[PDB]
């Protein structure tokens, strides 16, 4: 079947479905995923106790 309008419409729908959590997270829980340690200017002499990646 032609990509349009079958998947253009399906894709735009998928876009708005994933866009909700994204915006919900970003707008209601901005820091849920980041390390509070990154709100502290880098210090070459002190290493954080628990270095944990994204």
């Amino acid at each position: 079947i032609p990509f349009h309008p079958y998947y253009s419409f399906k894709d735009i729908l998928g876009l708005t479905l994933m866009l909700t959590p994204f915006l919900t997270l970003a707008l209601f829980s901005p820091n849920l995923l980041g390390d509070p340690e990154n709100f502290t200017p880098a210090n070459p002499l002190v290493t954080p106790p628990h270095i944990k990646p994204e």
Binding site: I1, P2, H4, P5, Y6
Partner: protein, 443 residues
């Protein structure tokens, strides 16, 4: 002698009704030869699931002899007088007519009446025609154009009566009873629903006289003289795709619901169709044809042929087009075809209609080229309009049409409508319904 004068000087069409309800009409000329026949308001639409293909089965026996005169006798008599016996059965209309010497108009009328009233329905002939009809169904199954139009009705009017084909089903043809055909005839071939038409060198009063003599059998009850109104057939925007890449070319037919006989807009639709016209690979005109679509077809080799149509019926109709193309040019053809339809509703020109109107006039005049074609007009006219419509009236109506009118009427039946589609053959390149549906607006 101007076109106008010639239109006014055409002999008028006489009509007279008998007590039994039958109508007798005819147009007089000075021709030693004539055509006369009975146009019945019957057909597949009047049939149902059990007797579909009966009117057709009947059409096959209507010439194999009556009670007064068995087969051989019937044939010899007609053959030996140089008369031609033809006829047809469609969805809403049936006909049996004879071409002969005006000198025999009366004997013919007797013959007609005998055919429509006393068909022998030979029990043995029935089983014989049962096999003939079955062969004709296989012959027609190879007629793409007709398979395509059948399918067009099958889906455009799905669920209803116009969905059925004229010839009927294989199961019906294999099991239709001598009684069923008989029932069909008695139920439908009835005076008030018939029209005795004739054209050529014939006396209207002599015609009506022989008519009184042979078309008698009057009715007693009220249910026998009332013409039944058929239940409406619902139109459905949809498609049926019958794919077979083994076929050499592809047939496509697209259409919207039409108004129906009595509607005046039909004159405009016919003008509109005249603008788009038609075409086929043997139109010498070539790349200079006035029909834009035809021009593009030639330049881009879009199809083998294409044609517009405005098929009418009592309460509905099919306005559309049909084309035949190579598997690889279907998409561009459909693109341009739909494009032109959009142009109609949106940018029609006065020049365009001026031409289309002339073309339409000469087309209506052509459908009155002989006694049979004229007789057909009469039969159909009374049966559909309940009165003959002169070429002068048509021309009167055609003359009133202008670009603006074409646009509004076309916008009315075409713009943003959900079409009915039938595609047969190597149709892979034809895009989906949604894509086609979008070609119904803006353009």
């Amino acid at each position: 002698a101007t076109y106008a004068q010639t239109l006014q000087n055409i002999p008028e069409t006489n009509v007279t009704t008998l007590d039994n309800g039958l109508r007798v009409a005819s147009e007089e000329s000075s021709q030693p030869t004539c055509t006369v026949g009975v146009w019945i308001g019957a057909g597949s639409r009047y049939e149902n699931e059990k007797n579909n293909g009966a009117g057709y089965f009947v059409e096959h026996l209507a010439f194999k002899g009556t009670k007064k005169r068995p087969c051989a006798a019937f044939e010899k008599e007609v053959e030996s007088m140089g008369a031609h016996f033809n006829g047809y059965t469609s969805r809403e209309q049936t006909a049996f007519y004879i071409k002969a010497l005006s000198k025999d108009m009366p004997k013919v009328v007797e013959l007609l009446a005998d055919v429509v009233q006393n068909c022998a329905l030979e029990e043995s002939q029935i089983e014989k025609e049962r096999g003939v009809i079955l062969q004709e169904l296989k012959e027609m199954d190879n007629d793409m154009t007709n398979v395509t139009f059948d399918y067009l009705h099958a889906t455009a009017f799905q669920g209803t009566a116009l969905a059925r084909t004229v010839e009927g089903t294989t199961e019906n043809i294999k099991h239709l009873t001598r009684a069923d055909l008989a029932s069909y005839i008695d139920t439908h071939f009835k005076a008030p629903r018939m029209v005795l038409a004739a054209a050529g060198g014939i006396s209207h009063k002599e015609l009506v006289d022989a008519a009184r003599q042979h078309f008698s059998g009057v009715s007693f009850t009220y249910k026998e003289d009332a013409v039944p109104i058929l239940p409406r057939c619902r139109f459905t925007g949809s498609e049926i795709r019958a794919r077979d890449d083994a076929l050499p070319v592809a047939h496509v037919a697209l259409a919207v619901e039409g108004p129906g006989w009595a509607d005046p807009d039909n004159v405009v639709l016919h003008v509109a169709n005249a603008i788009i016209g038609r075409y086929d690979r043997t139109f010498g005109g070539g790349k200079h044809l006035s029909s834009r679509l035809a021009a593009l077809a030639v330049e881009h080799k879009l199809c083998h042929s294409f044609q517009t149509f405005n098929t009418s019926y009592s309460d509905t109709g099919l306005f559309g087009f049909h084309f035949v193309a190579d598997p690889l040019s279907i998409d561009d053809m459909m693109f341009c075809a739909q494009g032109e339809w959009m142009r109609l509703c949106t940018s029609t020109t006065e020049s365009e209609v001026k031409r289309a109107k002339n073309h339409l006039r000469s087309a209506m005049v052509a459908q009155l080229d002989g006694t049979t074609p004229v007789c057909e007009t009469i039969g159909s006219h009374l049966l559909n309009y309940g009165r003959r419509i002169s070429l002068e009236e048509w021309d009167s109506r055609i003359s009133a049409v202008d670009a603006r009118m074409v646009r509004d009427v076309c916008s009315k039946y075409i713009y943003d409508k959900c079409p009915a589609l039938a595609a047969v053959g190597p149709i892979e390149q034809l895009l989906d319904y949604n894509r086609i549906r979008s070609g119904m607006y803006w353009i």
